[PDB]
Amino acid sequence: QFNPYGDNGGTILGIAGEDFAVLAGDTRNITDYSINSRYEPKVFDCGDNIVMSANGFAADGDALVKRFKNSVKWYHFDHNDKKLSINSAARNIQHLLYGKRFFPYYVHTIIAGLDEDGKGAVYSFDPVGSYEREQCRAGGAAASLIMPFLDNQVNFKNQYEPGTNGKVKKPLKYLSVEEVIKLVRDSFTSATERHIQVGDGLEILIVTKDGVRKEFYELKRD
Amino acid sequence: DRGVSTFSPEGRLFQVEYSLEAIKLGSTAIGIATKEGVVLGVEKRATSPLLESDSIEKIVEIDRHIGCAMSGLTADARSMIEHARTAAVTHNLYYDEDINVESLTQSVCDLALRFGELMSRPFGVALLIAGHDADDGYQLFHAEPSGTFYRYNAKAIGSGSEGAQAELLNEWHSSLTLKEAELLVLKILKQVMEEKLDENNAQLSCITKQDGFKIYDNEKTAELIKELKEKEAAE
Amino acid sequence: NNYDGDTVTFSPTGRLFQVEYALEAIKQGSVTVGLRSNTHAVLVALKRNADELSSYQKKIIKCDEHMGLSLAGLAPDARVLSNYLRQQCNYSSLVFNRKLAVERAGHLLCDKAQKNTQSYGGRPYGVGLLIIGYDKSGAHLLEFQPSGNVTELYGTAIGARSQGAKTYLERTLDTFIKIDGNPDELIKAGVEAISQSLRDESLTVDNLSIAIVGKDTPFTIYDGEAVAKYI
Amino acid sequence: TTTLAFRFQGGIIVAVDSRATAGNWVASQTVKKVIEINPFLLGTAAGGAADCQFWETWLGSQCRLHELREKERISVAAASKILSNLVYQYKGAGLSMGTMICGYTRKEGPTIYYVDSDGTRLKGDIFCVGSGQTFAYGVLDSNYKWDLSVEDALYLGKRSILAAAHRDAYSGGSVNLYHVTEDGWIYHGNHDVGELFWKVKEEEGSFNNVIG
Amino acid sequence: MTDRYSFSLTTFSPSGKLGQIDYALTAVKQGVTSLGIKATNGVVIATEKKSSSPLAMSETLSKVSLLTPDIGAVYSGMGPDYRVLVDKSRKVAHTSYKRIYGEYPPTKLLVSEVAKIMQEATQSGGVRPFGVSLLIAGHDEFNGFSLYQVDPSGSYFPWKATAIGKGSVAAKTFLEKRWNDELELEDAIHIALLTLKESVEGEFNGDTIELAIIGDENPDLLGYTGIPTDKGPRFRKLTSQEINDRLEAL
Amino acid sequence: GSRRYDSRTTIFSPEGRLYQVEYALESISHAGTAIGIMASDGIVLAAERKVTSTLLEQDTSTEKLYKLNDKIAVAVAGLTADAEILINTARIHAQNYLKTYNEDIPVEILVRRLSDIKQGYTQHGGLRPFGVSFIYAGYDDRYGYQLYTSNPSGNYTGWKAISVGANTSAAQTLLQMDYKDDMKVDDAIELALKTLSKTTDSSALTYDRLEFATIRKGANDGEVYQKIFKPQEIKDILVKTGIT
Amino acid sequence: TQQPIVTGTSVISMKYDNGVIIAADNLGSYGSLLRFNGVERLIPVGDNTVVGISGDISDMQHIERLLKDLVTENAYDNPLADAEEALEPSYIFEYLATVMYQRRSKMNPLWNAIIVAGVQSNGDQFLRYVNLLGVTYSSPTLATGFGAHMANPLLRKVVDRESDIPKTTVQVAEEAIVNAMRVLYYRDARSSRNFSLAIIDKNTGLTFKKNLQVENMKWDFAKDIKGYGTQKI
Amino acid sequence: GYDRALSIFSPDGHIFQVEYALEAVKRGTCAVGVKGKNCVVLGCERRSTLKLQDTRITPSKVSKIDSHVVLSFSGLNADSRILIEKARVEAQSHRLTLEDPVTVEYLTRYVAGVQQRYTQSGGVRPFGVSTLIAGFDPRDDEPKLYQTEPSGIYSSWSAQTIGRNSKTVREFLEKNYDRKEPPATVEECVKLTVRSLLEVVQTGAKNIEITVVKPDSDIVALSSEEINQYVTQIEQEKQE
Numbered sequence A: 001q002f003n004p005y006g007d008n009g010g011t012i013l014g015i016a017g018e019d020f021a022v023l024a025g026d027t028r029n030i031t032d033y034s035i036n037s038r039y040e041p042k043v044f045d046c047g048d049n050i051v052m053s054a055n056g057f058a059a060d061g062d063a064l065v066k067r068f069k070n071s072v073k074w075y076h077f078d079h080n081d082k083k084l085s086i087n088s089a090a091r092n093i094q095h096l097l098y099g100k101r102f103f104p105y106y107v108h109t110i111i112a113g114l115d116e117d118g119k120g121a122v123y124s125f126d127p128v129g130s131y132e133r134e135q136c137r138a139g140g141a142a143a144s145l146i147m148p149f150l151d152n153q154v155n156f157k158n159q160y161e162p163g164t165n166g167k168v169k170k171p172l173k174y175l176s177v178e179e180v181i182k183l184v185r186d187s188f189t190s191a192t193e194r195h196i197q198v199g200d201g202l203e204i205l206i207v208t209k210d211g212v213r214k215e216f217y218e219l220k221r222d
Numbered sequence B: 001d002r003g004v005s006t007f008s009p010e011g012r013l014f015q016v017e018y019s020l021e022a023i024k025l026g027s028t029a030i031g032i033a034t035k036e037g038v039v040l041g042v043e044k045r046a047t048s049p050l051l052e053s054d055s056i057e058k059i060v061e062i063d064r065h066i067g068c069a070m071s072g073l074t075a076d077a078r079s080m081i082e083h084a085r086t087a088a089v090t091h092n093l094y095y096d097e098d099i100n101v102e103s104l105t106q107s108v109c110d111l112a113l114r115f116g117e118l119m120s121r122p123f124g125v126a127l128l129i130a131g132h133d134a135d136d137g138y139q140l141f142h143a144e145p146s147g148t149f150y151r152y153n154a155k156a157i158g159s160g161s162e163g164a165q166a167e168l169l170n171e172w173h174s175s176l177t178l179k180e181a182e183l184l185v186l187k188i189l190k191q192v193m194e195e196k197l198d199e200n201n202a203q204l205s206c207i208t209k210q211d212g213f214k215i216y217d218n219e220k221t222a223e224l225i226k227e228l229k230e231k232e233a234a235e
Numbered sequence C: 001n002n003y004d005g006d007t008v009t010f011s012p013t014g015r016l017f018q019v020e021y022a023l024e025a026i027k028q029g030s031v032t033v034g035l036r037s038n039t040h041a042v043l044v045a046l047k048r049n050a051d052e053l054s055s056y057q058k059k060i061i062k063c064d065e066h067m068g069l070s071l072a073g074l075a076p077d078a079r080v081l082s083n084y085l086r087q088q089c090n091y092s093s094l095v096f097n098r099k100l101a102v103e104r105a106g107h108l109l110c111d112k113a114q115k116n117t118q119s120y121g122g123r124p125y126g127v128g129l130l131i132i133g134y135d136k137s138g139a140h141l142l143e144f145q146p147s148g149n150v151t152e153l154y155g156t157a158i159g160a161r162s163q164g165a166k167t168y169l170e171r172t173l174d175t176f177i178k179i180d181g182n183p184d185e186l187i188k189a190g191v192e193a194i195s196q197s198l199r200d201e202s203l204t205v206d207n208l209s210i211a212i213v214g215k216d217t218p219f220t221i222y223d224g225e226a227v228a229k230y231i
Numbered sequence D: 001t002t003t004l005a006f007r008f009q010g011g012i013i014v015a016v017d018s019r020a021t022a023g024n025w026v027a028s029q030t031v032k033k034v035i036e037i038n039p040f041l042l043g044t045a046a047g048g049a050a051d052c053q054f055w056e057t058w059l060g061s062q063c064r065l066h067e068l069r070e071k072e073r074i075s076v077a078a079a080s081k082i083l084s085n086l087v088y089q090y091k092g093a094g095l096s097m098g099t100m101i102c103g104y105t106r107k108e109g110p111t112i113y114y115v116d117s118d119g120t121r122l123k124g125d126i127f128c129v130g131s132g133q134t135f136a137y138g139v140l141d142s143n144y145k146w147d148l149s150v151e152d153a154l155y156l157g158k159r160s161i162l163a164a165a166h167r168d169a170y171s172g173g174s175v176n177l178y179h180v181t182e183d184g185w186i187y188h189g190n191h192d193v194g195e196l197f198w199k200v201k202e203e204e205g206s207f208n209n210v211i212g
Numbered sequence E: 001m002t003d004r005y006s007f008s009l010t011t012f013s014p015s016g017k018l019g020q021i022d023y024a025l026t027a028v029k030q031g032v033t034s035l036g037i038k039a040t041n042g043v044v045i046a047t048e049k050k051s052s053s054p055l056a057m058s059e060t061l062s063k064v065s066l067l068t069p070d071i072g073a074v075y076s077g078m079g080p081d082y083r084v085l086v087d088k089s090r091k092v093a094h095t096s097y098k099r100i101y102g103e104y105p106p107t108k109l110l111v112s113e114v115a116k117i118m119q120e121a122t123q124s125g126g127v128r129p130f131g132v133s134l135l136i137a138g139h140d141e142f143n144g145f146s147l148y149q150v151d152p153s154g155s156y157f158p159w160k161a162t163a164i165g166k167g168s169v170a171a172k173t174f175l176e177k178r179w180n181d182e183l184e185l186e187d188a189i190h191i192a193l194l195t196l197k198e199s200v201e202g203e204f205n206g207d208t209i210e211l212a213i214i215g216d217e218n219p220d221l222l223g224y225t226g227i228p229t230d231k232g233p234r235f236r237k238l239t240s241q242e243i244n245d246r247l248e249a250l
Numbered sequence F: 001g002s003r004r005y006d007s008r009t010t011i012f013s014p015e016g017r018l019y020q021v022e023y024a025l026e027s028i029s030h031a032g033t034a035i036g037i038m039a040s041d042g043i044v045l046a047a048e049r050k051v052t053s054t055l056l057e058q059d060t061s062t063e064k065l066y067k068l069n070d071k072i073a074v075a076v077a078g079l080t081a082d083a084e085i086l087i088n089t090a091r092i093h094a095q096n097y098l099k100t101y102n103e104d105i106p107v108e109i110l111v112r113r114l115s116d117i118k119q120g121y122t123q124h125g126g127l128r129p130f131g132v133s134f135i136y137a138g139y140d141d142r143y144g145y146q147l148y149t150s151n152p153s154g155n156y157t158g159w160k161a162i163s164v165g166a167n168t169s170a171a172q173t174l175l176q177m178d179y180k181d182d183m184k185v186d187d188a189i190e191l192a193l194k195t196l197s198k199t200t201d202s203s204a205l206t207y208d209r210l211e212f213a214t215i216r217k218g219a220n221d222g223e224v225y226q227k228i229f230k231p232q233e234i235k236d237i238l239v240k241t242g243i244t
Numbered sequence G: 001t002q003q004p005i006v007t008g009t010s011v012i013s014m015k016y017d018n019g020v021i022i023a024a025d026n027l028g029s030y031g032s033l034l035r036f037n038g039v040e041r042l043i044p045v046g047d048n049t050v051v052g053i054s055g056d057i058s059d060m061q062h063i064e065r066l067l068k069d070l071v072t073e074n075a076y077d078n079p080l081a082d083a084e085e086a087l088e089p090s091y092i093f094e095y096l097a098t099v100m101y102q103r104r105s106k107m108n109p110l111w112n113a114i115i116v117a118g119v120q121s122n123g124d125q126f127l128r129y130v131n132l133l134g135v136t137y138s139s140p141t142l143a144t145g146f147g148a149h150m151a152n153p154l155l156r157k158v159v160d161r162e163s164d165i166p167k168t169t170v171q172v173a174e175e176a177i178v179n180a181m182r183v184l185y186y187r188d189a190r191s192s193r194n195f196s197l198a199i200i201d202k203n204t205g206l207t208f209k210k211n212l213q214v215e216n217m218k219w220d221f222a223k224d225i226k227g228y229g230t231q232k233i
Numbered sequence H: 001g002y003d004r005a006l007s008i009f010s011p012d013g014h015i016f017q018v019e020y021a022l023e024a025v026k027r028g029t030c031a032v033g034v035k036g037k038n039c040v041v042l043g044c045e046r047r048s049t050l051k052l053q054d055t056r057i058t059p060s061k062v063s064k065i066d067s068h069v070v071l072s073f074s075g076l077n078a079d080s081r082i083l084i085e086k087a088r089v090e091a092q093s094h095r096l097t098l099e100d101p102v103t104v105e106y107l108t109r110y111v112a113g114v115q116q117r118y119t120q121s122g123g124v125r126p127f128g129v130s131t132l133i134a135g136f137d138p139r140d141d142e143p144k145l146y147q148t149e150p151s152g153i154y155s156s157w158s159a160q161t162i163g164r165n166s167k168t169v170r171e172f173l174e175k176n177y178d179r180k181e182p183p184a185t186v187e188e189c190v191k192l193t194v195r196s197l198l199e200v201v202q203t204g205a206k207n208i209e210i211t212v213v214k215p216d217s218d219i220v221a222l223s224s225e226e227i228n229q230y231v232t233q234i235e236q237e238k239q240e
């Protein structure tokens, strides 16, 4: 019997700073035990300082990104070139996803950008549209490997102040773009080591008020 | 007879032009836009003294940030308001934000020409759509049955429109306060109204960023009427 | 006379009066001018107001990053047609990853307007459009009439007193066509062209409306203080 | 999930956890399971995350359209029935929703309606909904009285979620408290179980099963 | 495109007349004379075969039609309208009766179904009434022999004997003098031929006259044997020779 | 297009009348008179056939009086073909009610639904109305014996005695004169015939030009019987009242 | 819901400095039966694109007709049909990719794996894959079926990343493709010796080679192999 | 389907079909609505050219839409049934979804919306009917009286009349009805309603119908003798 879904592997990662936000993702595309492409980007600039990635089944992922990109275009036409805020984009994506509630897009979606106060924002979606704003989110094949590391290093979970008898927690603070990129790179090298579907290359998209910058790094190709 | 969507030799749609004549027979409605807010006011015009004038609903809420006044065949406005309200709430559902006043007006005006041989005839009612948004601030729109809408600093529609519009031309300036605008609507309404203006046969409303769209009480308007008369006698 | 009741009727001399009456609605509309060089294409439009208290009716609409038009006549009909163009430009992008040719854009509008002139119940569109764009074969300017007739031109103008600007462009043809790699000078030529259609009124800051598209220029519209440069 | 809401002398208490799971994978510890429909209406969320979140957001739009059309705030009964009639249309399609519509109106007073995805709609004083509902019931029922103070009622609601957060593997994160009065709903803070458990253990002397 | 005529083309005039029905009846008046006579043991229906050209083969054009094995029909007015009514009448006898009850409908009910069709052409959108009056002769077990007239309005009346079309006024007067309740079938055929000679002008023989009967069952015309209850059609069309035999002893 | 040929059947006159309904009533006024008279112990239906021919088969004929169910009958005035369309609908509606509630349909409910159908043809659809007026005669266990009438407008009203068709003005005056509330069926039979006999456009009223029917409780114990009179039975009742 | 009947096996391809090479054998298998031997599975569209198709052949023939019709439709009212407004590989691919995904979304897929190889108007190499699921991806080397498992490893030794493309000549690239086709003949049970090869170059244009054969095969060592373990005769 | 636009604008800006529908209302028998301090009374004319009527079974002029709301009308009788039916269904549909009976304003708004829809829908003519809708909202003791008309406009009235010679009875009510002090009791309200109809009717026998509606679904129709007592009382006071 025909199975309309497939697993294209890969993994993605979003972190939000004070005045910036990053959305990273490896460039490896796979089916079963074969590599399809060592460089197939899945993190996209969608306009209005919104970056998006829909990891999982690539065909559904591409379809969604394509449709959201188109949603941004028509938002400009219908509302006098108004900038689509990250919170508005998120809600719009929920309706795109839930629109196919009974034949879902098999993807974990993450978008990143700046909120209307200029602060860094990351939103994450399940396959049928439930969404939540967070400081931190990993998605995809190696999400289970990366996410607990992020809890520890971004949100300082289970870390207490030395000598305070485990009474005072390590205080929360925003990370610099330099420190965030260090965590992204270490997360992906670690994921590459222990997950077979992760490797080849790492592409990061950084979002500030100035625009959308890109950075690329090699990953192990085994 | 003849087609509903027929052009005249001058290049106008007969039915649209005839619906405009129906709007001239309607009761007067005035709107004035300021930097402190937008004021909407209407002539109620009760056909008989036994009619309870508070039930005459010619000023209407579309959303918290958008209000609406009407003139002409007011029964036709019900489905237009229903559409506007749905459009406003629906956009909030899809985009987690308030909808632009212009975008709302455009959505209403898309219904206008959806008639022919869709509904059987154009709307016989004009609307003054007032509101506020973060981008273009305080706005006043005049939505016709032709499908056209103009933004206005001030605008009068109805039977006393051409006389009131000429008065608004002289009186309006870019530094009008909200209180000044309120009185100005009452002043111009009292001029063009047949019966003598009071709190029962005329109604005021406004929309401000802070408090949103509010229809004034008959007690509040009565004081603004009394304040208006005193100021005219004072010089 | 007896043959103007609907669009489905021919006159004894072979005329469609309803289509001609729709054409008449354009002549009443405010003037708008279109012209192009080899690198850029420009739309200039005189906007019209109800009175001093009102805003000025927006004449120019964007269809894609590389295409858009100006209108003259029934504005709601321009909204319907511009929306159709937006969808067709968009269909070409999503399905073929291909920017829609300005020539095909014209062909699609022609065929949409035509269907309304051969069927009972419907009516012709009551608006004229000037479509500009930059595609794989360079800059383009089209003139759409609701009879269905679409025409590619170097320059043109439609609306009330459009004959003045159209004569000027016919004289200036050799000059403005070679304004390559210079946006501001091509606009100046368009602003001087539309000025030949003015009577009693002159071009003010909230009256003039300009749009441009070209080689390294997306379709953008200029209004308000952004057109003060060209007065 | 674990969610509860109970009626008492001083109005309504509503308490929920904040965990979200995908099987045994703890997907989130910071989910908002209380939807603020309006200043007088609350909705709780348990079951499918998208189903609850999408349709309760939609419910809020329908309640807004009611007060625009009728110039009057929608009743808790009418609001709950809009949702129950909606899910009933989708009965068999596989929606997964366990919700509670809580609020105050003049005609009704404080009111709670249990609404779920197989179409059940029930008015009641006490309800617990979710994978850890039984754990919440155990604590809530054994300590519930109508004459509880606002202070004691808030605590019992909090303590009942904490109990379920502890025992139920698919509940936890943090406790979100709400109090609904004649004047509307009042938020009573987010309470992380990480600190709240030990704070409760020490002060209350409970949780003796755990290594202190 | 599409049928935009969804409105009635037959409407009441100020005087209360339904114009198109009246005009349809006028068309029937212009039509060739046809008649029907009911006997005690049968029914006869007859009409003149007005030939459009002597080159035309009048045998191919059948004015008298079999509807069921025990029911026949003849008309006056517009032939094409009659032809399509016969097609519809034959089909409705099956769809709305035989496929339900496993037997042919009684005369009165088939007539009722034909009337319904003609009534709908009087009220439905974008159609004119049928320009014919029918005479339907038939037999059934519980009602015996019967004769019905059906007008463009959809009205139908049972008759002992009647005539319609060109010379119907004179023909009805002739039938009043000759008709009695003791008439045998052969006597009714004789009277039918006498009545028809008055209205016919040119040739009067078996080739210019079309005549059929509803009489006794005809086992020879059934086409098969073996079922006792099936005894054959009561409808029989008289041959050209059979008519001429009766014209000698006229 | 087709607009040119549209009569616009469902519109108002400047005076606020429905043209087609008014003209349909004018049509009905030329139809054979039909009379309904309601007594305390039954109902009478009498109707005059339209100018009969001597060669018309009288015994196996039905023009005026039709049976809707066991408890309800109607007298027709107007186009017969139109009436039959409506009668079959009414017959079906009665059976739907019986199928749904396991009870015979109340008279008014049947009358209302049939009248609602007529109303529809005057407000929408662009079709001509049914050129028919009914007299409904029936019984149910709520209101007992009932007489109603409906017309092309779709408006219906109840009556003690009523006429439709031709000469209703003259007929209604005569009924209003001799009718009284404590009347019996046999007396109502006599009134119905006497009224037709005076209002008829014919020279003399005979058995062959009439249709007659009664709805009595004259069956055995607490049950209603419908009697559609045979030719010979009309001949006898006409002699018994001294008209012939 | 389908099941493929008559099928085509591997389609292999790669980029080189000035263009792209694509190849596919001429077999139409009917299960284990090697039914049809004259089947062309490389279909040129214009003089700048070649679509290589594997999987169900009935569906392949449908796609042929669509592409054929696409050329016709593009020519309509298009004076620049053989110039600026000619069909690009990217246009042809996106069209197919749209169809493939629409068909999977209607649970009635075109049971194929497709590789669109060509050269764009600006000289850039185009090579992209799409299949019955609507899944798309691009790479310096692309292959379907067994090609993905056996050809890609060999072709990636020549062009392992983007920077290796300018360093690879058409001679070297074709040699690798022809070698890969031989390996597939050794090891793929539904392959044939006969195949077609197409080169789309930005300078020399489209070169379509038919009736090629796998040659220079190693079989001699087979004679020394006796039994399956112990046997010495 | 029949599509023709029957209700359309004319050069002077009038929709003649809607205005001719008002003429049908003007032809109809008079109907009056008067609301007191704790009640509403609906009075209705019945023309006396119809004798030999059966008043048991003849459709009553006042119709119950729910147990707490009533609807009277003037104009085409057949048209009124369609509005009443639609209103009754909407009344039950409201109870089903909102778990609360309709307000008199809501029910009026619905009926008025139906009437409006028929003024700009293809293939249909407007309703030749104006209605008086009266009753009491659930758990409320404030009397409600609304009027609708073919165009679709609706409004609330302290007292109002519609139908033939309604301009005469409206004249009467305008001077006899005090806003500051409405009819304090049921008797006072009924008397004023009967008085107003006696300006137009003819005889006070079987020509006047009266229906009294009180709070909490308390509706009752008066009999002939009960109404006749008001007629007898008014005439004796008149001779002065």
Ligand SMILES: *[C@@](C)(CO)[C@](*)(O)[C@H](CC(C)C)NC(=O)[C@H](Cc1ccccc1)NC(=O)[C@H](CC(C)C)NC(=O)[C@H](CCc1ccccc1)NC(=O)CN1CCOCC1
Residues within 6 Å of the ligand: A101, A104, A126, A127, A128, A130, D001, D002, D019, D020, D021, D022, D023, D025, D027, D028, D031, D033, D045, D046, D047, D048, D049, D050, D052, D096, D130, D131, D170, D171
């Ligand atoms: C307690 C906490 C647990 O039951 C509550 O009941 C909460 C309710 C809160 C969130 C409102 N319920 C859940 O957390 C709920 C449990 C559940 C899951 C699936 C079906 C029914 C109930 N969890 C979810 O809804 C999660 C939330 C995400 C992870 C933030 N979502 C999923 O599991 C999604 C969507 C499931 C789905 C439903 C209907 C149609 C299609 C899909 N599924 C995935 O993300 C699949 N998978 C997760 C692991 O990574 C690979 C992809």
Ligand SMILES: [Mg+2]
Residues within 6 Å of the ligand: A192, A193, A195, A196, A197, A198, A199, A220, A221, A222
């Ligand atoms: Mg790896």
